[PDB]
Design a protein around this motif. Structure first.
Motif, PDB file in Angstrom:
ATOM      1  N   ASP A 185       0.873  -1.149   0.000  1.00  0.00           N
ATOM      2  CA  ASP A 185       0.000   0.000   0.000  1.00  0.00           C
ATOM      3  C   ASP A 185       0.916   1.205   0.000  1.00  0.00           C
ATOM      4  N   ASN A 239       0.941   4.039   2.542  1.00  0.00           N
ATOM      5  CA  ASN A 239      -0.391   4.094   3.157  1.00  0.00           C
ATOM      6  C   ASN A 239      -0.982   5.511   3.174  1.00  0.00           C
ATOM      7  N   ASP A 247     -10.624   1.311   1.429  1.00  0.00           N
ATOM      8  CA  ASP A 247      -9.370   1.220   2.182  1.00  0.00           C
ATOM      9  C   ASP A 247      -9.666   0.892   3.641  1.00  0.00           C
ATOM     10  N   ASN A 257      -7.946   2.827   6.560  1.00  0.00           N
ATOM     11  CA  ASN A 257      -6.538   3.116   6.230  1.00  0.00           C
ATOM     12  C   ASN A 257      -5.591   2.609   7.318  1.00  0.00           C
ATOM     13  N   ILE A 258      -5.724   1.336   7.693  1.00  0.00           N
ATOM     14  CA  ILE A 258      -4.882   0.822   8.765  1.00  0.00           C
ATOM     15  C   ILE A 258      -3.509   0.544   8.218  1.00  0.00           C
TER      16      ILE A 258
HETATM   17 CA   LIG Z   1      -4.225   2.233   3.075  1.00  0.00          CA
END
Ligand SMILES: [Ca+2]
Ligand SMILES: [Ca+2]
Lengths: 119, 119
Positions: free
Chosen positions: A23, A111, B23, B111-112
């Motif tokens: 990601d 991310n 996400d 979004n981890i």
């Molecule tokens: Ca992400």
């Protein structure tokens, strides 16, 4: 197959975990859209395009097709004993792992906020 | 196809952007492995497994296969026109959109850090 792609990334970039490329930017990791955020992200965009082209081969599932390749001292070689799907997928994976090994990795591009940066 | 799955989610979950799901967790967008972090993430794991079954049908590319469906009142129906690939992918999408509506959404799971949380 995806596990082999991870192993290729470890062959060419053993300083990092494959998760680092799972990601990153708008394109590294499943899916991708918007404008590539950097060189590494461009590698992933070309890898998704490559997989797109491999998926035109009937029955070809890049994430699942097991191919034949060698990692020898940081060199990746796709072997001759691959059918069309395997050969295509192997080549995508090989070219991406080499591209990743040449690109600078920016922690602020790991991310990211996809909604905000990738439309 | 992906555009249709988005519309299905817009249908069962009119209160949220589709990006809220794109996400989420270990499975809704990127990553695609590890322990599902909650019930919504499990919805996504099941969806991924459903697509994986669908792709066995050759030529069947769940993200790109256009099917026939309807969203009425909030109730998704896959039409009887659909060929094998279409019927299967539409069902996967339908089931996931229903599942999303019924599962609690936790902002902490958006979004981890996949590397840290999806091993
Ligand atoms: Ca992400
Ligand atoms: Ca991608």
């Amino acid at each position: 197959n995806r596990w082999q792609f991870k192993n290729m990334i470890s062959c060419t970039v053993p300083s990092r975990s494959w998760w680092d490329f799972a990601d990153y930017g708008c394109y590294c990791g499943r899916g991708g859209s918007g404008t590539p955020v950097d060189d590494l992200d461009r590698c992933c965009q070309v890898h998704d395009n490559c997989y797109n082209e491999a998926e035109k081969i009937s029955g070809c599932n890049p994430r699942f097709r097991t191919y034949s390749y060698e990692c020898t001292a940081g060199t990746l070689t796709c072997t001759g004993r691959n059918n069309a799907c395997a050969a295509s997928v192997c080549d995508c994976d090989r070219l991406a792992a080499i591209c990743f090994a040449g690109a600078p990795y920016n922690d602020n591009n790991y991310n990211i906020d996809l909604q905000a940066r990738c439309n | 196809n992906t555009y249709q799955f988005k519309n299905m989610i817009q249908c069962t979950v009119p209160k949220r952007s589709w990006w809220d799901f794109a996400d989420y967790g270990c499975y809704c967008g990127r990553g695609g492995s590890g322990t599902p972090i909650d019930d919504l993430d499990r919805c996504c794991q099941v969806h991924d497994n459903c697509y994986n079954s669908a792709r066995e049908q050759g030529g069947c590319r769940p993200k790109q296969k256009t099917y026939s469906y309807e969203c009425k009142a909030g109730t998704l129906s896959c039409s009887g026109s659909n060929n094998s690939c279409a019927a299967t992918v539409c069902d996967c999408d339908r089931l996931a959109a229903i599942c999303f509506a019924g599962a609690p959404y936790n902002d902490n799971n958006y979004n981890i850090d996949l590397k840290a949380r999806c091993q």
